[PDB]
Design a binder for these strands. Structure first.
Lengths: 193, 172
DNA sequence: AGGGTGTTCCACGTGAAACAGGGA
DNA sequence: TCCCTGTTTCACGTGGAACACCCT
């Protein structure tokens, strides 16, 4: 139960090659263990609900002669983080981009998909999707949004276009007084066919 | 909360149903006892400290090694049962095992398929009248045909080439 | 686009059965 | 004649490559 959550964020291998990479210690692993990833325990890595790793025919019977049994926990920063981030995620007073940040933060730091994210914050999942594509825009565009010269609808049409295109269409959107509808049409003929 | 914590304190049971821990072979770690334990801080002294539901690893190591170490004297059925056990009493991918015992993954598979054969077939392989060359060809087959062909193997003493050919016709 | 698994079929070295001398 | 031993050849089950299906 510990590992399926350990592996959870961003490894290139489904098992994190961190318990088996002990390989042969070669008097070389107790030297650079040093500042390691902040939380681990010996053969099996009880997270917050401490537990035991399953078979370990090999991994627990090599052991080593000089051990660090040190009980150290890191988790609390991360879980206090999670409550802080979710508690943030639902806020009346949030500009589109900060929100999008917290969405992206949760989606990346932890694995639970944007669908559930959307269940928490009570919106559709294509919404969390679009609020988050808001982050990739030009800085003229983000400035415009924050400045409320344009609105998330407009900005959400602009994503995927080079900065030059973005800033032309943005220049049109403002001072042609465009509507999200007109904006989607105007943008439409600048995307591929 | 506090009330429930005084509750199991007075009551003999402590854990009316004991907690579950693991033994590191050096230390002890919990499984689903936060309630029991935190509550049992108000109670006194260590209050489990005797055989209660717990998982021990040293035992599991003995198991791990007795399994991994076999004098190659076993017939295909305890062999199969060991292979299965190695992925049944613990969860394993067949490939990994193939790597351990120095056989191909296929060999592991077929050896384990041996365990799903008719009682008659199984008992003719633990007895010495059938081989695995024979037995593995009768898998995924209905009982009646297992019986039929089996009689044909034992009766006419067919070579597995025969047996595979003969059983071929009783397969789609 | 991928690993895990079940299922088919035949390559392979082993071991011996057959054959061939050969010493009487 | 018979037994012993040197040689050639190929049947056998074993285990594996390969194929085929799920599960994703």
């Amino acid at each position: 139960e510990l590992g399926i959550d350990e592996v959870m964020p961003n490894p290139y291998q489904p098992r994190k090659v961190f318990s088996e990479d002990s390989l042969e210690e070669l008097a070389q692993s107790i030297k650079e263990h040093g500042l390691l990833q902040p939380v681990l325990v010996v053969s099996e890595n009880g997270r917050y609900h401490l537990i035991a790793g399953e078979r370990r025919l090999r991994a627990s019977k090599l052991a080593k002669m000089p051990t660090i049994k040190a009980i150290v926990v890191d988790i609390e920063q991360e879980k206090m983080r999670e409550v802080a981030l979710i508690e943030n995620i639902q806020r009346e007073d949030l500009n589109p981009l900060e929100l999008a940040r917290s969405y992206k933060e949760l989606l990346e730091s932890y694995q639970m998909t944007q669908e559930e994210l959307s269940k928490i914050v009570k919106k559709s999942r294509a919404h969390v999707a679009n609020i988050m594509r808001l982050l990739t825009l030009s800085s003229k565009v983000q400035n415009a949004l924050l400045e409320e010269k344009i609105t998330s609808g407009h900005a959400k049409v602009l994503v995927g276009l080079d900065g030059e295109k973005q800033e032309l269409i943005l220049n049109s959107i403002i001072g042609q007084k465009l509507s999200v509808r007109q904006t989607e049409d105007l943008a439409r003929d600048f995307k591929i066919n």
